[PDB]
Structure formats: structure tokens, C-alpha cells
Amino acid sequence: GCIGILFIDLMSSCGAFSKEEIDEVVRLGYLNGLFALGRSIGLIGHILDQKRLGSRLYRHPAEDIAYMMPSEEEIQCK
Amino acid sequence: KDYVLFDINTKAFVYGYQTNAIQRMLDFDYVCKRSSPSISAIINPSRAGIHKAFWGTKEIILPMYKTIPLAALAYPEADVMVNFASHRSAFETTMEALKEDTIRIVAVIAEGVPERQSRVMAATARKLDKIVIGPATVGGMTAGAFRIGNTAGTIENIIASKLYRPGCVGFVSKSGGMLNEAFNIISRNSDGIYEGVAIGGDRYPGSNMLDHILRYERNPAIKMIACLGELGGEDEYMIIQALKEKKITKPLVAWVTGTCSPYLPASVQFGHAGAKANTEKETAQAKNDAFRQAGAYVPRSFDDYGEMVRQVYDMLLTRGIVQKFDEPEVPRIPTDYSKALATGDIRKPTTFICTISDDSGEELLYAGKKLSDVLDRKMGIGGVIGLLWFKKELPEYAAHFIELVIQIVADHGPAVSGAHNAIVASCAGKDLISSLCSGLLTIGPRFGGAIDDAAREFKRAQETGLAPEQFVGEMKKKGINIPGIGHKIKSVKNPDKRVQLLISYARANFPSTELLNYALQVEELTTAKKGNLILNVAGCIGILFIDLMSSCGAFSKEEIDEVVRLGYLNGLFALGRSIGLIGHILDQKRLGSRLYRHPAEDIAYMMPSEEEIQCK
Amino acid sequence: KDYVLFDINTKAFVYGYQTNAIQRMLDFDYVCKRSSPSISAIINPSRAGIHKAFWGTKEIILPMYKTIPLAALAYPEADVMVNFASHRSAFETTMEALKEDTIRIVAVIAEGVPERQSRVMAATARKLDKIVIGPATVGGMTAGAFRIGNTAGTIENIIASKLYRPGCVGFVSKSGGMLNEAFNIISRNSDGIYEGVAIGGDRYPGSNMLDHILRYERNPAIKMIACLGELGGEDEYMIIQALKEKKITKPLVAWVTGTCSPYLPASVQFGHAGAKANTEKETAQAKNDAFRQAGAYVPRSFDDYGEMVRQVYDMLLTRGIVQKFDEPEVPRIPTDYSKALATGDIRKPTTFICTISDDSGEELLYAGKKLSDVLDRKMGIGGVIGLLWFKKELPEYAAHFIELVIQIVADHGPAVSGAHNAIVASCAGKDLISSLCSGLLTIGPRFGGAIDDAAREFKRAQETGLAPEQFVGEMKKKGINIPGIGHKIKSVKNPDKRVQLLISYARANFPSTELLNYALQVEELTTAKKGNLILNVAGCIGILFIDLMSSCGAFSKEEIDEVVRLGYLNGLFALGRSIGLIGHILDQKRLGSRLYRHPAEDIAYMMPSEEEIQCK
Ligand SMILES: CC(C)(COP(=O)(O)OP(=O)(O)OC[C@H]1O[C@@H](n2cnc3c(N)ncnc32)[C@H](O)[C@@H]1OP(=O)(O)O)[C@@H](O)C(=O)NCCC(=O)NCCSC(=O)C[C@@](O)(CC(=O)O)C(=O)O
Ligand SMILES: CC(C)(COP(=O)(O)OP(=O)(O)OC[C@H]1O[C@@H](n2cnc3c(N)ncnc32)[C@H](O)[C@@H]1OP(=O)(O)O)[C@@H](O)C(=O)NCCC(=O)NCCSC(=O)C[C@@](O)(CC(=O)O)C(=O)O
């Protein structure tokens, strides 16, 4: 929220964008690109960290999942 | 029976998403050996859905409804509503529940409810033969049968005070916290409470103490009545008048708090909204004296309340009015993991290790360094990558070489595989993230992702002592392309200025460029055969990064070997080229581009014959 | 001191990745108040790296080395090796450790080690002034200082037997399990053991009982010696001879098990490899008699062993030889979560719910139905999708319509967005999964992913009572394309036979096609304007699926509304079209296709001017 709001203030006040240009930027969705680009640094870092650690295959623990199957009656009708 | 408020068959709705209160009720139902939970549904005005909670150690699902009428229609057996609405909505929600034919009791927890609203709720309850416990109360409970929300706290307290089995004492107070203290006092000085109710401390309650005391008088299971009142209002005078009119025949223990008031200024308003003696009659002294004169068992102070309970109970026990019963088996319940972990009782191993960042403290850390210090020191994007990928605070020229690479590989036009796929996904109306990943997934051995292999193969050739001609010759014999060599459009005739820009930076700032010098000798040989076999941008980055790591002093030979083996360097191209991919995606959205379909005239459709698909 | 085997400064290597034994050692070090762990490194022949374990409630890292020389060179302070190698490698690993100048003690756990190998290990140990405890032993321990692997079991047993503080008893046995029982017996009948060692039950041990008994005789902290032997071999005769030669002056409690042997056949070989009396001298009777005659304190049977310990200790206590000491504070350690969970002490809520499959039992379940029953009933791929996506056992014609859709949308040539992107990634040398996802990420509103919106918009128009002309008119006014209408190559002039095939199946098998009839009326109007505005394959699937759900009897109005709102139907196109995407990827790999780069002549490069980039 802080990045999106401040970027609108930046575009509105820097003199480089017209009201139409700002409206186009908002409508088309540019700003999520900043988070994808920035966060790719940490994602690549986490990937490399697990390779250096020699980490094993993960399987989510069964004790963290409530398996709640429907009854035979439930799958036969509505 | 009209005198029974709750029993072991009582079903209730909990208005408000109060997960702790919901769990407390279920835990009591479980230790009381109930067959099914005392809660039929949760009323959550913000969301309809499901709520998962425990039944001992087993998880169960409770339905969640948005409104009171929808829940009542689904569960008509539920006649109690535990109302956790704020003081801003307590009146309208209680009045809505009271208008439902199937709801009989409403417990109002909220503090700060107007006196007029409480007067209207009390009158509405009396007119419809319903019960309002509160406002400003925890509720109450029938020992061994039902509890209102948080009444009687922890299961440990329920067990210590033997609240999982009924006794012979009918208890009523104004105070919620004192109702729990009283449960402890009474359990230690008698066979415990049968039922206990806190009417709240507001001067106009939904139900007065006498309403509950009259029910205890009719109940044959109750042989003893006990109550704890306070100064302000005239509620206790209803009890004293009933005691004088012989409407209460069972022995009644009574104490009115607020004896401090005459010693302090007249203007002092106490905790509860109704705890302020406006007249002499409203004082604790006038109330305790009128109680004494009416025949009640009144102690000298609150200190001897349990002793008065012990005296009245012992009297009933000797006279045969109350019978001694065998203590039932002590119930058990598993402790919540979070409690056992907090008290240090248990330990649990972590599944993952993280060495590059920590978000769990007061400030985000990148390889142990506070984000504030990273920014104050102007480490920049290259310095952030040094910390997160290499766990090093790199020399400035090494962080600037990383930033130079990102700018140099940011984009190389729309025609390359990654930009082309991202443009096709953007023309198909895809969002930015899907379109970006569509293009990033083309990064591999032929496009972009040759950096790791160029670093690997040139380092091996130069280290194992191969002459550039022997390396070129060996790779040709194995039928393996030299990674970092060759280009689709750049060549001897069309030189790649990006490679020149990376080479000038390394010559001006790296203490040594031995692997670059070797790579340039390999390039002289490859370009002599075919002009397009230049040292490309991927080969240039991989080779220069090896020279950077070898000469900056920050990496040992082992660290460099680990970087090469694990494949770090293709990350630089993925990161840099994401700038141009996002740009191409946005360009197609601004252009209003239509869906692309590859032209048929660019595809040779060559189907196999029927004979070919029938055999081999 | 030569008599001390282990102390509080002893550092050790654990040969073999025995995580439980590693944790047991660390837990003992923690309860004994050691400053640092007793383990310097783990020797894991399969892998070098790190091992995470607990130090109380805190997690620590232990280094892991592939070989004994590499670990010894890294941690020269470690002089003990706890060897968990199998009987197949116990000799060579113990001999390798004995050849290391810095290793002094090796504990061999393995059972089944040849007698010749043990003879060579014992002689090698004696020649180099080193100690071999084992083979076929748990090890031993110095109370309050160090434990060999699993010696003395659980921390609960360590606390109950007061093994966190030394006593005055020097103990030695053959049996590992009896060494732990003896720790309990001795703690209850004296101030406990100072040190205890189990030499193993093999007839040629690495160290004999006398080796340890002689160390106890020199140690001033030990005032009492106790030992438990057994029939077979002549080990105990070394003790009796030392007792006769006045080499053991401290009082010695001794018992030799195997008194049963003369009552049973001579051929009976007992548990331990060395437990078989070949001669009369080797029997328990001959050993216990020779012990009695040598001056040792020998009980009547094993039953009175603790009583003999109590008698000898009490004698030392009265005579002043042993001094009474104050019991140190009882140490504490957190319980492992898994133990508290198994015993039912704690409960922990699940984060996720799964309602569609269960892999945690004896057999995989798809919506509660065993995979075996799914296959025996020939439910097919359509029936599997009915279970996993809809949680229904669908009628056969509904499961066959799902399979018909998958076949019909499997491929539509290489030119479409998804197939085109998957081909470009495959030409770039990408693996199958990356290339597949590159193409699947183009599935959205214009290509493939129009199914959900077609179902949504046509259902709304038909339900809200809009006439086909009003729906066409309303969408045009909003500037919104009708989803499921329009095509790049199919039209009135080039009809889509896939749409015809789906329509014929629904007419022949669905009880009703009301939404299809409405959609076909919309198509008459759109095609009247432009021939390419046909009801496309995505619109046809979405609309027919609504008719299928509405008419098959298996879905309520609410269930259908939920399916439409959440977007299930685009999954059918993703699943079906993955067949053709994988096919196109494989086709390019078989063709040996080169890297694609979009031709420059198909791109209009239109850069902004310098003036345009400087202002707005
Ligand atoms: C680049 C390309 C795929 C071109 O392929 P082509 O399809 O044109 O050629 P091929 O069909 O493989 O063969 C042609 C003839 O030359 C021989 N020949 C070719 N390469 C040879 C070689 N490496 N070693 C020896 N010999 C070779 C081959 O043996 C045959 O000769 P012959 O047998 O006598 O008939 C190819 O060189 C290659 O795989 N290189 C290694 C991978 C690599 O480093 N990739 C990074 C490139 S930078 C980048 O990705 C970023 C980019 O700059 C991209 C952009 O802008 O485009 C941007 O910023 O976006
Ligand atoms: C299919 C396409 C993108 C074509 O676009 P085009 O770029 O050619 O056309 P546009 O530039 O949008 O406009 C042209 C003029 O017709 C008007 N006009 C167009 N569509 C109109 C419409 N839906 N409702 C009203 N009016 C319309 C428009 O208003 C303008 O008229 P005007 O304003 O007077 O100038 C377009 O129809 C569209 O988005 N449809 C809805 C999405 C949809 O259902 N997708 C599924 C298609 S099945 C599939 O994906 C599977 C496939 O079969 C694919 C394959 O094989 O290709 C396989 O198996 O792989």
C-alpha cells in the first residue's frame, strides 16, 4: 500500500507525467512489477541457500492437515 | 422445569467470532462427558463458512452463519445465545435474538451499554418470559452441564474447583471475576456450586439477583443459596423483601461489598457502572444490616465468607438436609501445544534453516545486517545482492559490477525467446506475473542461461592446463557447443558493444582478468572459423564473474568452486532481463495489441502416413 | 591421569549417522551442566555437511565429515570415537581410528564381529596404550561427565538413577542391558556409580573386565568395586588372580550369571557369543566359588546383588572410608514434542483441511473412495475428475462427457498461443516441464480460459430473463466481448466440427440443453454481423457443462452457483490442452529444432523521440 500510494504522489508531483499518463499507469497495472522484480532477489537467494545447505525434499507434515473425506452418501447425490 | 436455566441438553449460538471462548465452551463440554458440543453454530456478521476447533484431541467443524435468523432457522434446538457483540451493537443483536421464538436466554458480555437500552432489554425479556444475563458479565454456569463463554476460565481452574460435577449451592453475584473466585471459595467450604450466575455491575441489569435466587428456591437439587452484592442501586432490597415475605426458605449466605465508601469521598464512582451509593440506603452498611435483620447468614467481612458457607453447609449435612456424595472420576484434557511450548515443557525441531535473512525481529536483517544500516551505508542493489546471494559485504566495485550487468542485460529487444513469449502471453490478455513467468521459463542453455556453464567450462579448461586450441578441439570432438560462444545476430561484422562495456569495466577495476584473457584467445580461434562464434554477453558475464571472485579477496578457492558448481550466475540474467520482459508486457498493454496466432504460412504441416502410424 | 577414561573435558566423534544416539549424548551433556557438547564432529561415510540437533531447547549445528582422518585433523582435541559401524566394517573403522595419534578410546557397538578381528583390535589397543570398549556393547559412562552413545537410555532414567553426579562405585559388566539395570540397583543401595563400563559379551573382547577394575583401584574417588560377569571364557579368573595377588584392595562385589547351565543341556549356546561354558572352569559355579575363596563379596543369587552393594557401602560409610555428600540440584530438560503428542499430553491444531484425497492410510482415497474400487468399477479418467474436482461419483455419461472434452481440446495445432510458447521454450533447449508451463501460462481470457466466463455470462443472461438480442446489445454497450464467442480461424465459412461433436453428444445424452438452445440463438445474431463471431469451443464447453450440471440430478442449484463462481471449467482446457503442448515440445526435440528468434522484419521498431522522453 505504501509503494502504490507513494508512486502516485511521485508521478503526480515530478512534472514528468500528465493526468492521462498517470491514469494509464494505474489502469494497466505497472506497480506490481516493482515487487516481482525486487522480491526476485530474495527468491533467488532462498533457492541458493537451500542448495548450499544440501536440503532434502520437503513433504508437508500429515499432523498439519485435517483429512476430512466426504461420506459415501455425500458423493452419491448432492 | 421453569427453574432450570441450562442443562446437559442445552444448545447455544455464539454471536461473534470468539475462538478462545468457543474452545473454552467445547473443552468444558468434553470434561463434563457431554455427547455432543453445547454450540450449534457461530454467528459471524462478517462471514459465513466453517470454524475448526477441538473436541478433546479430535478436530471438529462448527458451521458459521452471517445472521441470527439464518442460524436459528438452521438450528431451532439452540435456545441460548452467548452475545459477544460490542456495546455499539449489543442492544440490537440481543433484541433480534429475543424476537426469535426459539431463543430463550441471551447472555450480554459487552461493557458500556446505555442504561436505557438495558432497561428495554430487561422489560422485553420479562414480557416474553425470557432471560437476559448481563450486560457487563462473563455469564455463569451450571456445574457439569453448560458454561457461558469464558465463565470459570481454564480447564485447570474447572478441575481445581470441581466444576465438572454439581454441588448443592445456588450462587449469584454482580461481579464476573468474583463469580470465579466464589466458585473456588464455595468448592473448598461445601460440596460446590450447583449453578452460579453473575448479573453484571450495571445499575439496570437484564436480570436482577432475585430472579436467579427464586429459581434456586424452586430447584430441589439446591439446598443452600449464596450471594455477593455491592453498594449502589436497590437490587439487594428485592432479596431482603423476599426473605422477609418467606419467599426464600433455604438458608441464604449474603455479603454486600463497598464498606470502604463512607471512609472515602462521596464523589467516588467505583469500577462497575452501578457501583455508586447515591443514597444512604444504597450503601453496603445499610444493605448488610437489612440482610442481617431479614435472617440471612451475613459474615463480619468478605474474609469470613467461605467460613459462613462452611457453617451453613455443615449445618445441612448434620441435619440430613444435604447428603454426602462420592466424588466422580477426575476428568482429563490435553494441553495446548502453545502452552507446553511457552512454559518450556516441550521442544520441537525446525524443518528448515535460513541463513540469508531474518524477518522475525524488530528489524529486517539481510545476512545479519539491519536494513537501516544497508541503506545508511548506500550499499545499493549490488550490495543487497552481495548480502542475499553471497552472504558478503562486497567491495564497492564488485557491487557496482553486479549493477552494471543488470543494466547491460535489462533488454535485448522483443525478438529473443523470453521477450517473445512474454509478449505473446501479454497479447493473450494475461496479467503481468503470468506473462513474466512465461518468458522467464525460456531461460536455459541456448537463451540467457549459458552463464553458469560458460563459467564452468572456461574455468575447467584454463585450470586443467588446456591450451585455447585444445579446448576448442576437445569440445568439437565431444559434439558439445562451447557455452558463452555464438550469437543469433551479433558477430565479427556486427560486434556486441555490451561485451566491450563489460570488458572495459573489468580492465579498469579488477585486480586481474586471467580467465578473460584466456576466453579472448578461444574467441580468436572460434571467430576464425565462423564470424558468429563470438564471446557472447552470457560467456562474458560468467568469465568476468570468475575473475571478480578470484581477485577481489572476498572468496576462498572453495567458495568460488561452490558458486560455480551450484549455479548462481544465471540468476543475474533472470533478474536483469525481468526489467525488459515487464517492459515488453506493458508495451503490448499500452498498444492495445490483439491476440497473436502464429501464421500458417510459417509452418510446414507434415503429417505421417496411415502406414507410418500403424507400425514402426 | 592414566586411570581416567572419560572426564567433563572429553571430546568425541560419532562414527555413523545415529541421530538418536547423538541427541542422547547432547542431552546428558546438557543435564550434567557441561559448557560445550561432548561431540566435536560426526563421521558420515555417505555425506559431508551439517547436522542440526538440540542443546536443551536451543538448536546447534554439528559438522559432518566423510572420513576419520579428515575429522581428526579438524578436531585434534577429540580422543574418543563412538563407532556405530556395522559388523562388516567395525574392524577396519576401529583400526583406522586406532592408527590416528589423537584418538585414544574406541567404543565398538556392532554385534557379530569375528573373534579374530576382536583379538587383533585388543592387541593393537594394548600395543598403542589405547582402549577398545566392545565389540557388542552399549559402551559405558562416567557419571556427571560423559556417556557413550545410548548408554543409560532416557534422560528420565538418568535422573531416576542419579547419573548426572558421580558416586563411589566402580562398575563393570559384560552385558549392556544389565549395565543399565545395575546403574539403577547401585543408585538405590549406595551413593551410585562413579563410572560404569560394559565390555560386551563376545569371548574375545577389546578390553577385559580387569583392565577397567585396575583403573578403579587407582582412582581415589572410587572406594567400592562392583562387577557382573557370566559363564563361558576365563575373563573373571583374571580378577580372582588379581584379588589373590592383593592387586585389588578395595572391597569388590561380584556375581557371575549362568547358574542355570548344569540344569540344562551342555549344547545350549546362550545370547552372548561368549556365553557357553566349554569346560567346568568356564561355568558360573566354578567362577562364583573361586570369587568367594578370593575374598570378594558374592551374593547368594542375582536377587541379593543390591543388598550386597548396600552391605559394602554401609560398611564404608560407618568406617569413614566413604563420606556422605549433599545431593546436587535435580537437572531439567524439555520433553520432545513427539513424545508429549504420542502420550496424549498435548494437542496441536492443523493449519490445512483436505477434503478431496487421503494418502495417509493403508490405501490412497479419492474423495473417500479407495483407488482399488475406483479402478475395479472402471470409473475412468472422467470418474477420477468427478471425485477429485466435484467430490461426486458422477453418472457414466457425465464422466464420458469430461473425457470427450479432454480428447476434443487435446490439440489445435502449433500456432495457438500456448502451443507456440511451449514450442519456443522447447527450441530454446528447455526441459519438458518448463516448456509446458511457459505455454500453460498463456491460458486466459482470449486463449482457452474463456470457459468460466462463458458459463457465467450466458447463465446470467438466460436466468435474469434477457432475450438473446438484449444480451448481445447490453454487452456491446458495456464494451465487453461476449466470452465464448469469436474465433481467429473458425467461422460461418470454416465451421468448427469440435463444437458440432460436443453438441451431438449433449443432444443424445443430456436430459436437457436449455442454455445451449439460448447460446445458439445468441450465435445466430452475432454471426449475422460478422462470420467469425461463432460460438467457439470454449463457449460450447462452458454452456454444455451448465446444462450437464443442471440436468444430471447430482448438483443442487447452490452447488452449480459455487462451481460457476469459483471457476472450475478452465481446468478442463488446461488439462486437455497439456496433451498437445507436451506433444509439440517432444516434436521439436525429435526434429532437432534450433533456437527461435522472432524475425526483425515482423516488428515495427518505433522509438520515442528525445523530446518525448524528456517531458510528458
Ligand atoms: C547462440 C546459439 C544458440 C546460436 O545458435 P544457432 O541456432 O544460430 O546455431 P547452431 O544451429 O547451434 O549451429 C551453427 C553452427 O555453428 C556451430 N556453433 C554454434 N554455436 C557454437 C558454439 N557455442 N560452440 C561451437 N560451435 C558452435 C555449430 O556447431 C554449427 O556449425 P557446423 O557444425 O559446422 O554446421 C549457439 O551459438 C549456442 O548454443 N551457443 C551456446 C549457448 C550460449 O552461449 N547462449 C547464450 C547466447 S547470449 C543470450 O542468450 C543473450 C542474448 O544476447 C540473446 C539474443 O539477443 O539473441 C540477449 O541478451 O537476449
Ligand atoms: C477469439 C478472439 C480473441 C479473436 O479476436 P480478434 O483479435 O480476431 O478480434 P478483436 O480484435 O477482439 O475484434 C474483432 C471485431 O469483432 C468483434 N468481436 C470479436 N470478438 C467478439 C466477442 N467475443 N464478442 C463480441 N464482439 C466480438 C470486436 O468488437 C471487433 O469488432 P468491431 O468493434 O466492429 O471493429 C475474440 O473473438 C475474443 O476475445 N472472444 C472472446 C474470448 C473467447 O471466447 N476466447 C476463446 C476462443 S476458443 C480458444 O481459445 C481455443 C482454440 O480454439 C483457439 C484457436 O484455435 O485459435 C484452441 O483450441 O486452441
GROMACS .gro file of C-alpha atoms and ligand atoms in nm, chain B residues 594-595 597, chain C residues 412 416 445-448 450 481-488 498 530 532-533 536-538 573 577, ligand 2:
model
   87
  672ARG     CA    1  -0.465  -0.820  -3.019
  673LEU     CA    2  -0.428  -1.196  -2.956
  675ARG     CA    3  -0.171  -1.666  -3.358
 1106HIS     CA    4  -0.550  -2.735  -3.205
 1110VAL     CA    5  -0.215  -2.106  -3.092
 1139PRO     CA    6  -0.946  -1.457  -2.136
 1140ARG     CA    7  -0.853  -1.462  -2.508
 1141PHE     CA    8  -0.696  -1.808  -2.542
 1142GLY     CA    9  -0.853  -2.113  -2.377
 1144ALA     CA   10  -1.286  -1.815  -2.166
 1175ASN     CA   11  -1.671  -0.901  -2.568
 1176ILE     CA   12  -1.915  -1.193  -2.520
 1177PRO     CA   13  -1.690  -1.472  -2.377
 1178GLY     CA   14  -1.722  -1.797  -2.574
 1179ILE     CA   15  -1.800  -1.601  -2.895
 1180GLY     CA   16  -1.545  -1.540  -3.176
 1181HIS     CA   17  -1.250  -1.721  -3.333
 1182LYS     CA   18  -0.921  -1.646  -3.513
 1192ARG     CA   19  -1.539  -2.976  -3.246
 1224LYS     CA   20  -1.953  -1.091  -3.858
 1226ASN     CA   21  -1.610  -1.508  -3.724
 1227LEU     CA   22  -1.844  -1.447  -3.424
 1230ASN     CA   23  -1.636  -2.120  -3.012
 1231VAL     CA   24  -1.516  -2.447  -2.840
 1232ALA     CA   25  -1.466  -2.262  -2.500
 1267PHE     CA   26  -0.895  -2.684  -2.112
 1271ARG     CA   27  -0.450  -2.891  -2.396
 1312LIG     C1   28  -1.126  -1.515  -3.013
 1312LIG     C2   29  -1.091  -1.365  -3.016
 1312LIG     C3   30  -0.970  -1.340  -2.924
 1312LIG     C4   31  -1.048  -1.327  -3.157
 1312LIG     O1   32  -1.001  -1.192  -3.156
 1312LIG     P1   33  -0.955  -1.099  -3.273
 1312LIG     O2   34  -0.820  -1.046  -3.224
 1312LIG     O3   35  -0.968  -1.164  -3.407
 1312LIG     O4   36  -1.063  -0.982  -3.264
 1312LIG     P2   37  -1.085  -0.846  -3.183
 1312LIG     O5   38  -0.964  -0.753  -3.211
 1312LIG     O6   39  -1.111  -0.863  -3.035
 1312LIG     O7   40  -1.212  -0.785  -3.265
 1312LIG     C5   41  -1.269  -0.819  -3.393
 1312LIG     C6   42  -1.403  -0.750  -3.410
 1312LIG     O8   43  -1.511  -0.839  -3.375
 1312LIG     C7   44  -1.569  -0.802  -3.251
 1312LIG     N1   45  -1.564  -0.918  -3.163
 1312LIG     C8   46  -1.463  -1.010  -3.153
 1312LIG     N2   47  -1.482  -1.100  -3.060
 1312LIG     C9   48  -1.604  -1.064  -3.004
 1312LIG    C10   49  -1.680  -1.118  -2.899
 1312LIG     N3   50  -1.640  -1.222  -2.825
 1312LIG     N4   51  -1.797  -1.059  -2.868
 1312LIG    C11   52  -1.836  -0.953  -2.939
 1312LIG     N5   53  -1.772  -0.892  -3.039
 1312LIG    C12   54  -1.656  -0.952  -3.067
 1312LIG    C13   55  -1.488  -0.684  -3.197
 1312LIG     O9   56  -1.567  -0.597  -3.116
 1312LIG    C14   57  -1.431  -0.626  -3.325
 1312LIG    O10   58  -1.539  -0.562  -3.396
 1312LIG     P3   59  -1.557  -0.404  -3.427
 1312LIG    O11   60  -1.568  -0.347  -3.284
 1312LIG    O12   61  -1.693  -0.386  -3.502
 1312LIG    O13   62  -1.436  -0.346  -3.504
 1312LIG    C15   63  -1.211  -1.278  -2.970
 1312LIG    O14   64  -1.324  -1.303  -3.053
 1312LIG    C16   65  -1.245  -1.289  -2.821
 1312LIG    O15   66  -1.177  -1.230  -2.737
 1312LIG     N6   67  -1.350  -1.366  -2.788
 1312LIG    C17   68  -1.387  -1.393  -2.650
 1312LIG    C18   69  -1.286  -1.483  -2.581
 1312LIG    C19   70  -1.303  -1.628  -2.619
 1312LIG    O16   71  -1.414  -1.680  -2.622
 1312LIG     N7   72  -1.192  -1.697  -2.645
 1312LIG    C20   73  -1.193  -1.840  -2.672
 1312LIG    C21   74  -1.160  -1.873  -2.816
 1312LIG     S1   75  -1.152  -2.054  -2.842
 1312LIG    C22   76  -0.989  -2.088  -2.785
 1312LIG    O17   77  -0.922  -2.005  -2.731
 1312LIG    C23   78  -0.943  -2.228  -2.815
 1312LIG    C24   79  -0.884  -2.252  -2.954
 1312LIG    O18   80  -0.991  -2.280  -3.044
 1312LIG    C25   81  -0.809  -2.128  -3.007
 1312LIG    C26   82  -0.758  -2.122  -3.151
 1312LIG    O19   83  -0.756  -2.237  -3.219
 1312LIG    O20   84  -0.722  -2.014  -3.202
 1312LIG    C27   85  -0.788  -2.372  -2.943
 1312LIG    O21   86  -0.848  -2.491  -2.930
 1312LIG    O22   87  -0.668  -2.359  -2.934
   0.00000   0.00000   0.00000
